[PDB]
Design an enzyme around this catalytic site. Structure first.
Site, PDB file in Angstrom:
ATOM      1  N   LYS A   4      87.800  28.013  33.574  1.00 40.73           N
ATOM      2  CA  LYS A   4      86.377  27.649  33.685  1.00 40.73           C
ATOM      3  C   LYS A   4      85.421  28.836  33.664  1.00 40.73           C
ATOM      4  O   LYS A   4      84.432  28.861  34.406  1.00 40.73           O
ATOM      5  CB  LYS A   4      86.123  26.852  34.969  1.00 40.73           C
ATOM      6  N   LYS A  50      94.357  31.524  22.739  1.00 39.04           N
ATOM      7  CA  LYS A  50      93.698  31.264  24.016  1.00 39.04           C
ATOM      8  C   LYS A  50      94.738  31.306  25.143  1.00 39.04           C
ATOM      9  O   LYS A  50      95.842  30.805  24.980  1.00 39.04           O
ATOM     10  CB  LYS A  50      93.032  29.888  23.978  1.00 39.04           C
ATOM     11  N   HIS A  66      95.136  31.794  29.828  1.00 39.63           N
ATOM     12  CA  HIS A  66      94.543  32.014  31.150  1.00 39.63           C
ATOM     13  C   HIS A  66      95.610  32.733  31.958  1.00 39.63           C
ATOM     14  O   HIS A  66      95.456  32.937  33.162  1.00 39.63           O
ATOM     15  CB  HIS A  66      94.221  30.703  31.882  1.00 39.63           C
ATOM     16  N   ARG A  71      83.446  35.231  34.992  1.00 38.94           N
ATOM     17  CA  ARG A  71      82.314  34.461  35.484  1.00 38.94           C
ATOM     18  C   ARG A  71      82.294  34.622  36.999  1.00 38.94           C
ATOM     19  O   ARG A  71      83.341  34.852  37.607  1.00 38.94           O
ATOM     20  CB  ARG A  71      82.507  32.995  35.091  1.00 38.94           C
ATOM     21  N   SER A  81      83.144  24.673  39.324  1.00 38.72           N
ATOM     22  CA  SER A  81      83.515  24.147  38.026  1.00 38.72           C
ATOM     23  C   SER A  81      84.968  23.724  38.004  1.00 38.72           C
ATOM     24  O   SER A  81      85.336  22.736  37.367  1.00 38.72           O
ATOM     25  CB  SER A  81      83.279  25.189  36.939  1.00 38.72           C
ATOM     26  N   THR A 127      76.014  26.927  19.320  1.00 35.74           N
ATOM     27  CA  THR A 127      76.966  27.179  20.400  1.00 35.74           C
ATOM     28  C   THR A 127      76.288  27.102  21.765  1.00 35.74           C
ATOM     29  O   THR A 127      76.827  27.592  22.759  1.00 35.74           O
ATOM     30  CB  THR A 127      77.654  28.556  20.271  1.00 35.74           C
ATOM     31  N   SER A 128      75.105  26.491  21.815  1.00 40.80           N
ATOM     32  CA  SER A 128      74.396  26.344  23.084  1.00 40.80           C
ATOM     33  C   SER A 128      75.048  25.188  23.834  1.00 40.80           C
ATOM     34  O   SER A 128      75.681  24.324  23.222  1.00 40.80           O
ATOM     35  CB  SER A 128      72.920  26.029  22.853  1.00 40.80           C
ATOM     36  N   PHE A 129      74.901  25.170  25.154  1.00 38.58           N
ATOM     37  CA  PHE A 129      75.485  24.108  25.969  1.00 38.58           C
ATOM     38  C   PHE A 129      75.113  22.723  25.442  1.00 38.58           C
ATOM     39  O   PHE A 129      75.977  21.864  25.255  1.00 38.58           O
ATOM     40  CB  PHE A 129      75.022  24.242  27.422  1.00 38.58           C
ATOM     41  N   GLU A 164      74.186  21.633  22.466  1.00 42.06           N
ATOM     42  CA  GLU A 164      74.901  21.292  21.247  1.00 42.06           C
ATOM     43  C   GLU A 164      76.375  21.035  21.494  1.00 42.06           C
ATOM     44  O   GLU A 164      76.898  19.972  21.148  1.00 42.06           O
ATOM     45  CB  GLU A 164      74.749  22.394  20.199  1.00 42.06           C
ATOM     46  N   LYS A 166      77.697  21.117  33.372  1.00 43.77           N
ATOM     47  CA  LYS A 166      76.302  21.571  33.461  1.00 43.77           C
ATOM     48  C   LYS A 166      76.037  22.859  32.681  1.00 43.77           C
ATOM     49  O   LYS A 166      74.941  23.066  32.154  1.00 43.77           O
ATOM     50  CB  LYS A 166      75.894  21.794  34.921  1.00 43.77           C
TER      51      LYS A 166
END
Ligand SMILES: Nc1ncnc2c1ncn2[C@@H]1O[C@H](COP(=O)(O)O)[C@@H](OP(=O)(O)O)[C@H]1O
Ligand SMILES: Nc1ncnc2c1ncn2[C@@H]1O[C@H](COP(=O)(O)O)[C@@H](OP(=O)(O)O)[C@H]1O
Ligand SMILES: [Ca+2]
Ligand SMILES: [Ca+2]
Lengths: 281, 281
Positions: free
Chosen positions: B41, B92, B94, B116, B124, B213-215, B217, B244
């Protein structure tokens, strides 16, 4: 059915492509379009594949790169194919500057032009006239050569075509390339295209583009060799689109008499021009 | 069926992802792979979409960007999806450095890491635990927060994760980004990714990548919002993946008591680290 050519503003063209010009002044160019301009058989398909790969970060070529003045009995118009086309658009044309949609110049659309030595163009064009049935039958090579020297072939004079665009390059964004340079060092020319279109790709990826855009590869690739088209349209059995892809192969077709006459005629039409072509390599 | 977590080399993980590790030491990395690394996240899907667009010159995200340790009852393994994957590959993961396939380090694979702030990650992650049914039920937020602070959640400690990779960045090609910087100025961060992966794109094209690539969209795009997956897998009705996408929203979930305890615990775990996070913007 090998229909005669149609003259337009002094320019002889495929009957259908002549008809396609009307619907053509409606065409509106975008600032980010990329126009691929060339006299026929000069590396159009080659540079198109290169630009398309570049635009994809590394369907057949004629669908991915709309052919501006395209039009044929059983096939979707060039402007049609361009409707379902999202920006940024890669365009293809062989139109002389007198017939070019003004909008392309007004929007300052980037142009990638490719010129090829006239002798290799002539031979390549003679074989294409044979396989592509929208062209009037070429006749003998001897007669075609004469028509080619007199600009009495589709899209008119090669001499004027390579010169006008060369001159346009002084006041319009144009990357003028040579078929021969692309033959000699493909990577060098692809890097020039990348810089010109404001893009960059890792060395490794470019080396991969050089391998896949080679004549050998592009001759096997059904998406680039035009073999998916219908036979009564293009008869690959008569002459394959991907014929030889060589520089200097015109020596095995031109007779010494024809070569002497061509050179004399050439020196006369390319006098004041600073354009320099090499018929070998 | 919310199976308990499985510990591996001290690291708790999704039962299935734990099983997927065996088939995982067979994995062989290529020199041109691009590894997207993040603690859960933290902007994984976000930076993945960005990198994918870049790699296409401008299918769902989980098919285009194989998830290394991925594995689930009715879904193709992460290494499976990677078989039908041509170079250059975007990966990808984690995985903490102790579980990372050694081959990725040995080949010097380029890494784009995103960190983050821990508070927003925790909130999240709590909501994700709820909707994604491969995770054990989270319990109350109060209890989850405690598990998160003790690294008793999938992929272990966030504190160690952001620090080890930060340190790896000193002797391995790593572009360490911050979720918050991407929020604040997306174009700035995308340009950093372009330069890092040896690519370039016209300004206009990047501005277009910023919009798509905005939230907003990415929350509508079914290829990026994970809504095509099955309900008993991910229940978007419980909590949407694209929740969010804000920075600093943790203030509406953390109670003052929880915040005081978290800060105290934080200062203690991030002591000798030079990492600086901003919980707002
Ligand atoms: N990748 C490539 N490398 C070299 N020549 C190529 C090529 N792709 C096409 N060609 C050649 O380019 C000519 C066609 O150009 P266009 O696409 O402008 O019509 C043909 O020339 P030849 O007839 O001399 O073989 C064709 O074989
Ligand atoms: N384009 C985007 N812009 C901003 N946040 C985004 C985003 N795409 C996903 N996110 C957010 O990133 C988190 C998921 O990250 P990951 O892909 O690593 O699992 C979620 O955070 P929230 O739960 O805080 O909304 C999600 O809404
Ligand atoms: Ca053609
Ligand atoms: Ca996921």
């Amino acid at each position: 059915s090998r229909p005669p050519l149609e003259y337009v503003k002094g320019v002889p063209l495929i009957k259908y492509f002549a008809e396609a010009l009307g619907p053509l002044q409606s065409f509106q160019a975008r600032p980010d379009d990329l126009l691929i301009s060339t006299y026929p058989k000069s590396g159009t398909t080659w540079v198109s594949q290169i630009l398309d790969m570049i635009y994809q970060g590394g369907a057949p070529i004629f669908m991915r790169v709309p052919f501006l003045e395209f039009k044929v009995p059983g096939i979707p118009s060039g402007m049609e194919t361009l409707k379902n086309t999202p920006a940024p658009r890669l365009l293809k044309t062989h139109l002389p500057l007198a017939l070019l949609p003004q909008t392309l110049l007004d929007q300052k659309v980037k142009v990638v032009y490719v010129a090829r030595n006239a002798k290799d163009v002539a031979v390549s064009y003679y074989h294409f006239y044979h396989m592509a049935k929208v062209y009037p039958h070429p006749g003998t090579w001897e007669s075609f050569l004469e028509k080619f020297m007199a600009g009495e072939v589709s899209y008119g004079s090669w001499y004027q075509h390579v010169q006008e665009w060369w001159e346009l390059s002084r006041t319009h964004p144009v990357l003028y390339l040579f078929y021969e340079d692309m033959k000699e060092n493909p990577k060098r020319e692809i890097q020039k295209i990348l810089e010109f279109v404001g893009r960059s790709l890792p060395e490794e990826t470019v080396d991969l583009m050089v391998e896949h855009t080679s004549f050998k590869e592009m001759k096997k690739n059904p998406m680039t060799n035009y073999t998916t088209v219908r036979r009564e349209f293009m008869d690959h059995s008569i002459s394959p689109f991907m014929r030889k892809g060589m520089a200097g192969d015109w020596k095995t077709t031109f007779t010494v008499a024809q070569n002497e006459r061509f050179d004399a005629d050439y020196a006369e039409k390319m006098a004041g021009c600073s354009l320099s072509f090499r018929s070998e390599l």
